[PDB]
Design a protein around this ligand. Structure first.
Ligand SMILES: [Mg+2]
Ligand SMILES: [Mg+2]
Ligand SMILES: [Mg+2]
Ligand SMILES: [Mg+2]
Ligand SMILES: [Mg+2]
Ligand SMILES: [Mg+2]
Length: 214
């Protein structure tokens, strides 16, 4: 089959935050049918990153989500051709991040061409001050619109001093070929940085995702 139980990941992110350019590359592996994945990320340019690494993590593939048999899988259907996604991440203090990921497939390895751009993060805010701890688990709401798939999610970053920092995600997924469209459904997520060094030049990221419906 096109989608194998065990697959790889190759990616390169080029981006900027408040005008500060940077570049990150990574390699990883995951189990598409189990909804689990892991990757090692290395900052190649712009290091050391002057902002909270957490704003980048959800940008570093919904194929890695366990879909039950009674819910159409827009993502696994899209291959070998693949799909691409666009997303705006609106933080409560005005910081806004736009990201895109063009996903292709070469053998058993997915290739990500990522672009990330964030602006208006206050200098004394939790992102520029690196006050974030982690993203809380979430439930993404997916629905069809204009022949493509939308995914919206209320995200929250736990803060070092206590409390949370909210962000609203709005993603558009676009398959590179005609695939069956799903009915309204959900995808639970839980992304975690398992390990990292002092300035985050090296990061080990993990994610577990499962779809569910009414
Ligand atoms: Mg730039
Ligand atoms: Mg302020
Ligand atoms: Mg803070
Ligand atoms: Mg419609
Ligand atoms: Mg570095
Ligand atoms: Mg449900």
């Amino acid at each position: 089959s096109v989608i194998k139980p065990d697959m790889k990941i190759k990616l390169r992110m080029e981006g900027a935050v408040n005008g500060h350019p940077f570049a990150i590359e990574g390699v990883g592996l995951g189990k598409p049918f189990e909804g689990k994945q892991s990757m090692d990320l290395k900052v190649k340019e712009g290091g050391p990153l002057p902002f909270a690494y957490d704003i980048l993590t959800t940008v570093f593939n919904r194929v890695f989500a366990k879909y039950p048999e009674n819910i159409v899988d827009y993502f696994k259907q899209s291959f070998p051709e693949g799909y691409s996604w666009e997303r705006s991440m609106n933080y409560e203090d005005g910081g806004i991040c736009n990201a895109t990921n063009d996903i292709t497939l070469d053998g058993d390895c997915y290739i990500y061409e990522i672009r990330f751009d964030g602006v208006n993060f206050p200098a004394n805010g939790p992102v520029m001050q690196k006050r974030t701890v982690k993203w809380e688990p979430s439930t993404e709401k997916l629905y069809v619109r204009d022949g493509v798939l939308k995914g919206d999610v209320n995200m929250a970053l736990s803060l070092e001093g206590g409390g949370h920092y909210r962000c609203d995600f709005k993603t558009t997924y676009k398959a590179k070929k005609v695939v069956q469209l799903p009915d309204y459904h959900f995808v639970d997520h839980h992304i975690e940085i398992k390990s990292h060094d002092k300035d985050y030049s090296n990061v080990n990221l993990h994610e577990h995702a499962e779809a569910h419906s009414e």
